[model samples]
Target: TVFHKRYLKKIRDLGEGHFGKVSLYCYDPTNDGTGEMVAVKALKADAGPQHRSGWKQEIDILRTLYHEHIIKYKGCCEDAGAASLQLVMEYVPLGSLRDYLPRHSIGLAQLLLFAQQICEGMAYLHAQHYIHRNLAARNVLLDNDRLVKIGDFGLAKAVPEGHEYYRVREDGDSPVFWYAPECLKEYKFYYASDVWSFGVTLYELLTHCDSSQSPPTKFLELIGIAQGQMTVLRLTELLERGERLPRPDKCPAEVYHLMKNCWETEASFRPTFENLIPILKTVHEKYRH
Candidate 1:
C-alpha cells in the first residue's frame, strides 16, 4: 500500500454535507517537510454502523475503478482526535453542478457533454454490479473545463448478482424529489432505477430547471387537487391511489416521454440503462448543436 508519511495540514473548510466534512489539505508527498495541496474527505464515522459500512464500501469499490469521471481515492487515515476515516483525493476547485445549474443554463451542448459522461460513468458502475442510489445535481462535480465527475459515494452500493436489496424507511430519508418509482418504494434499487434517474437528469438538462419529474403546481393539478393542498403523506397517498404521477411538460415530447417511462410503477415497465444509448444519441444529434 502506498502511504504518505507526512502529516496533513488543514487549510480551509471546503464544505459540509450529509456524508461528512471536506477541506483542503496541505501534504508533502515526498515527506521532505514541504506541503502539497490535496482534497480530504473527513467522513462522519458516528453516523451509525450502516453509514460506516457505506464509507468502507466506497473505498473498496473506488479502489477498483479507474474512470476519469470518478474521483481518485488516494489513501486513508484515522486519528483519535478525528475518529473518522479521511479519504485523500485530488482537488477540483471549480465546484459542482449544484453551484452551476442555478446560476446559468450551461446550454444544451455543454449540458449534453456532462450528461453523456455521467451516463457512461453510471453505466459502467451498474455493469460492475453497483448502484448509485443518490445521483442528483448535488452529487455531480465539475472541473474547470466543465467535465462531470460523480462524487460522494455515501449512497453508492454494490448489487452483487442474484443478491437482493433490502430497504428500511427512516424518518429523515424523504423522497429525493427526482427519484424514480422503484426508489420511492425503496424496494430494490436496480440498474433500471439508475436509468430512470438518468432520464430525469437529462430532462433537467433539456429544460434548465431541476423540477422535471413533477412540479408542485403540476402535481396537484394532475390529481384533481388544489395547489399547495397536499401534505407529504397525502401526496404519496395520491401516488399510491393512482400508482403514477404525470409526465413533465416543460421538455420536448420524446425527452419527456423518456423521463416518464423511466419511473414506471412496475419495475418490468422501465427500460434498462443500456437501452438509453440510441435514445440519448438521437436527442444529442437533434438538440446539441
Candidate 2:
C-alpha cells in the first residue's frame, strides 16, 4: 500500500546528515508497538539541485530492487508536514553490524553466517547489473543475529549495458580504504571491486570491529610510515607490492585464506560475489556446531 504522511509518527533520529536526515517512524494511527516500523529519509528543503538529483537516483534504484538480504524499500510519502519527500524503508532495528558486533558475544559460525548473508546480497546486487561501490560492515544492517541487509546506495551505480566496469573520479568522500587495485590505480570499478571490500568487511567481523584494527587505521599506519602526499598512488604501490591487511586473531585459517581470494590484486583473479556464496555456506557449516 502507498504510505501517507499522518500515519508516520517519528520515533527517533537514526541519522542526522548534511542534506537530509533519517529517522525511525511507526506507521500507525491507533496501534501500539506492533505497527510497522520504518526508516524514513526526509529531504531538506534547502538541498541543492545536485543533492536532489543524487537523491532521485538513490530512490529510483531502491524502487527497482527487491531482495531478501538487501534492505527492503517499502513506499514513499510526500510529507505534507515538511513539504518534502520521505523515503520509507524497512527498519532493520538492530542497526549496523559495526555498531552491534563489538559489544556482543557472537560465535565464529554466527559471523560466518553474516558473511554468507552479505555475499548473498552482493551476488544478488551484481545480478541486477548494479555495483555497490561502497560496501562495509557499517553499511550492513542487522535485523537480528541471523539476518543482515545491505543498505546505503550513496555509492551504488548501475553498470552500463555491455560494460564490464564503470569509471568514476575518486572523490574525498568515497571509501578509499576498502578499494581494490583497479579502483586505486585506474579508477575503474569492476564487479570484483565489491568483492575486495567484502574481504575487508569480513576482516572487520573477525576482529569484532575493533577500532585499532579498522580498515582506515590499518591502511593509514602503513600508508604514512612506509610511504603519501598522493594517497591513491601510495596505496596502489603498496597493494601492488603484495602487501595486505594481516589476518585477525582467532579467525579460522581457511577463512583468512578465502579473504585473500577476495583480495587478489588483479580484479579478474578475485572471486565473483556469485562465487562466494557456496564457499561461505560450507565454511559457515564447518565452523558451526
Candidate 3:
C-alpha cells in the first residue's frame, strides 16, 4: 500500500536506529479532525540496496501475518525522489516494554499476563517458521489497554526449510548479551535463542525497573546488559566458556528455575514457547485470586 506524504503530519521523534528514525505522526485522510496517530519509520536517504531489500522483505512478512500480539502494519510511502522511505504502522501509545517496565511496580498477576502474551506472540512467530533474532524488552510494544505486542522485525529471519535453525551471517549485528551459547559460538539463530532472550526480558521486567532511581543510570545499566558487558561473559568469552547471566535479584525461586531452563547450554534442551505459554497460564491462575 502507498501512503501520500501530504496526508501525514509529524508530531515528534519516537526513536532512531541503524536503519532510520521512527517518528510519531498524525494521519488525516480528510483535512478534518478525523485523524489518528501512527508511527512512521523513515529510512535514511543513504539506505543502500540491502536496506531496500530488507525493507521490501519486511513488507512481505507483515502483509500476510496477523496476530493481536504483533504490531500492525498500515502502509508505506516510497518515492524515487524522496530522501527516505517511510513505513506506517499502528500507534502504540504506551510505548515499548522497556520504557513501561521501570515506571510501575507490576503485580505478579500482571507480570504473568505480560509473560503469557509475549510467549503467545513468539509461539505464533515460530509456528510461521520465523525466528525473532532480536527478542528484547525494547522490541515489545504496549498499548493503552495494557496489551503487549512484539515489534521491530528488522533482525527477524525465516528458518530454512528442513532446518530447525538459521545460521546467521558472521557479520550480522546482534545483542551478544541476550544470545544463546550456541548463537555466540556458531553464529546461529533459532526459536530457542528467542526463548533465551525472552528469559532475559523477564529478568528485566522483574528487577531492572526502580522508579526511585535516576533514569540515566537505569538506561546505562540496560545498555551495558544489552551489549553483553554487565557482569556476564563478554561475546568472546561466552563462545569459549558458555556462560549465561546470573539469576536476577528478588525474583522468586520458581521464576529463576524457569530462567535457568531457558538458558540451558544445549539449545534443544530449552523450553519451547508452546510449553511455556501453558505454564505461564497455570502460574497466573494459581496466583490470580
Candidate 4:
C-alpha cells in the first residue's frame, strides 16, 4: 500500500531502498512559496523501535550537521497508527558513486578529492562520537552538481569514549572483498576499521570498470587457489575476469602498500585517514593531469 502524509504529495517515484519506497515529493518550504523536489524515505509501520530509533538518529545527525560530502536531511514525519514514517531529504540528481566511478574512470585526482571529502565528514562525525558503520560506493551519492555525498546510515552508531563495538554474526558478508580482516573476525569495529573499509572502497572505485577486464596482475599467481576465497578471490577475481581500469598499478608503490596495510589482519596496524592524506597528495602531485 502507498503511504504518504497530507503535508507531502508524491511528485515522482524514486526507488526502493533497504527499507521502504523513496519518492520525489513536494511540500511547503517554511509555509511560503511553492516547494521543490525532495527525496522522501518511507518505512513501514511493522518496523520496530530499532527502526524508529535509527530514523531518529539519522534525523538528529542530519539536522545538526552540514557537509558537502554528506546527504542533506530535511525533516521527518511519524504519526500514531500510521503504516509508515516519512523522511524528507535533499534531492541528488547525479545518483550513485558506483556509476560515476566507472563511467568517468575515476582518476587519482578525483578519488582523492572525493575520499578527502568523505574523510572530512568522517572526521567531523568522529569528533561528535558517531560512526557511519556502512561506507561503500552504493551508499555514496552525487548531487546534481556532481559533488560527492554520503548516504545510508542504517548501521550507524553513536559511541562514547572507551566504547566498544559488538560483533554481529552475519556482518561477514559485508562486501567481503572490502571487509577488513578485523571485521571478518567479528571483532568490535573502530574508526581504524572504518579506515580499512575506506581503502577497499578506494580499490573498488579505482578498479570498478576494469573489474570486467583482467584481474590485477598481482593476483594472477593465486588464480587457481580456492583457499583464499574470502580474503583475496571474490574481489581479485573480478579483476581476473577482465573487469579493470587502465592500470591502477600506475599508482605509487607507497599507495599500494597502504592499501595492503588497511587490509591487514591486525586492525591496529591500519593507518588513520590523516596519515593517508600525504601519500594520496603525493600520488596526485606525481601523477595528476
Candidate 5:
C-alpha cells in the first residue's frame, strides 16, 4: 500500500549521506497516538542529476529483491516539503550490526548466526543476478527475529546481459580492502568478488566490529602506504602473496580457516555464495554455545 503524506510523522533522523538522509517516521492512518514505525530514504532538494539517477537506481534494485535476510521494502510517498518522493522501508530499530554489536556483550554463537544469515542473504541476492557491490557490516540491519537483512543497495547492480562480472565504472571511492583481486586488478566485480567481501564482513563480526581491527585499518597497516600512496597494485601484490588479516583474539581456528578460503586470490577458486550457505550453518552449530 502507498503511504499518505499526512499520516507519516517524523520521529527522528537516522543518518544521511551522498544523495539524502534516512529518517524514522510514524505512519498512522488514524489519528491515534500509536502507529507502525518506518524509515524513509528521502532525496535532498538540491542534489545534481547524477545523484537523482543514483537514488533512482537504488530503489529500482531494492524494490525487486525480497528475502527474509534482505531489507523489506514498504511503499513510497511524496515528501511533505521536499520536491522528491520518499522511499519507505520497514524500520529495523536495532540498526546496523556495526553500531549495535559494540555496545552489547554478544557471544560467538550469535555472531556466527549473524554470519550465516548474511551468507543466506548474499546467496539470495546472487541468485537474483545482482551483485551487492558494497558488502559490509555497516550495510547490514538487524531486527526482532535475530534476523539480519542486507541493506544499502546503493551500489547494487544487475550483471550485464549474460556476463559474470560488472566492469568497474571508475567512479566514487572503492572499498579496496574489502575487494577481491579480480576487482582490484581487472576492474571487475564477479559474484565471487562479493564472496571475498563476505570474508571481510565475517572478519568484522569476529572482531566484534572494533574500528581498530577493521579491514581498512588492518590492511592499511599491513600494506605500508608510506603516509600517502595507496594503490590497487600494492594490495593486489600483498594479497596475491598470501598475506592476510591476523586472527582476532580467541577466534576459532575453524572459523578463521573459512575466512582464508574466501580471500582466495583466484576469483574462480573462491566459494560461491550458494556454496557458503550450508558451510556457515554447519560451522555455526559447532561454535554456538
Candidate 6:
C-alpha cells in the first residue's frame, strides 16, 4: 500500500458500483469527529486484470489533473493485506449535480452560472488534451460550498494531437441521448463530442430534469406528440433524421439558440469551450439581478 490504512476511518457507505464501493472516511484518527473528511473508493480485492489495469490508468490521469473545477485526488492504498484497492479522493458533501436539482429552485441566473462552471471545467479538460467520454450531470459534482467540480474519470482518456477522436468500444454501456450524431455513427469521440454532451446538460439544468428521464420525450409530449407514445427507437430515428429536441417552455430563446448550435450536425461547427465561456458569461450578465 502506498499509505498507511490506519489513518483512514470509514464513516459510512456513500455509494457502491460495479468495481466495489465508496465510503466516507476520516483522514485523522485521534480527533476523527471532524478533523478531515475524504472519500475512499474500494475496488474489490478479487477484481480481474482489466479492472485493476483501468484503476491504475485512472490514477495516472488523476494525479496529474489539477483545476479548480476538477475533483482532487488524494492518493491510493494497494496493500495486499489491506485487501481491496482503495482510491482516496476529495469528499464533496453536496454530492452530484443531479442531487441539487430536486432540492433547489434554481433560477435562470443560477443555471447560466452552473453552465459556465461546467464549460470552464470541460475547457480545462480539453486544454489538457483529456476527453471525459462520460460527461453528464451525474459526473459533475457539488462541494459543500455548492461550487462545480468535475469528477468520475472512469471513461476519461488523454488523446494525442492529430487524432480528433477516440474509437468507442463496440460492447460498452454509453449514454446515447447525449452522444453526437457522428459519435453514434462512427463511434468516434473527441472534445467536440463533449461539447454536444454539454448542450444536453444545459438542457437538463433548464428543465430541472435528468437526461435519462427522456428530456426529448418530455419535450415532444409538451408540444403534442400523439399522447406521448414515442419510444426510444422512435426518438433515435428522429434524431438521425436531423430532428432535435424542442426547447423546454422555460428555456429562453437565446439559450435555446445556443443549444441548437451545440447540437449542430457537424461536430466542427460546435463552439469550443473557450468560445462558449464568453457567450455564457454574456447570458449570465444579461439575466443576473
Off by over 4 Å in 3: 79-85, 208-233, 236-243
Question: What is each predicted model's overall lDDT from 0 to 1?
Answer: 0.65, 0.86, 0.75, 0.63, 0.85, 0.77
Tell me, what's the RMSD of every candidate?
4.3, 2.2, 4.0, 5.9, 1.8, 3.9
Show the colliding residue pairs in model 1.
none
For all candidates, the clash counts are 0, 0, 0, 15, 0, 0
Model 1 off-target regions past 4 Å?
1-7, 29-36, 45-50, 164-171, 207-232, 238-250
Ranking the candidates on TM-score from highest down gives 5, 2, 6, 3, 1, 4
Per-residue lDDT for 121-233 in model 5, tens only?
89988888899988999888889536888878877889876789898866546778788888877899999999999999999988889999989898878767674555567
Query: Against the true structure, candidate 5 has what lDDT?
Result: 0.85
| Model 3 Cα lDDT, one tens digit per residue, 152-231 | 88777788779988887654456666677777677778789999888877766666444333333443454455664433
Candidate 6 or 3, higher lDDT: 6
> Per-residue lDDT for 60-159 in model 2, tens only?
8889888889999898898776565678899998998888888987799999999999999899889899998888888888998898899788678899
* lDDT (Cα, tens digit) per residue for candidate 6, span 218-273: 64563455645444445456666778766876779989999999988888899999
Whose lDDT is greatest here? 2
Question: Lowest lDDT 10-mer window, candidate 4?
Answer: 213-222
Ranking by lDDT: 2, 5, 6, 3, 1, 4
Residue 238 of model 4 has an lDDT of 46
Q: In terms of TM-score, which candidate is strongest?
A: 5
Candidate 2 vs 4: which has more TM-score: 2
Answer with 1 or 5, whichever has the higher lDDT: 5
lDDT of 4 by residue, 201-265 (tens): 66666665345432333344344456554545454444335332233655656666666666655
Candidate 6 has a TM-score of 0.86
Error of 4 at 287 (Å): 3.4
Alpha-carbon runs more than 4 Å astray in model 5: 80-82, 224-231
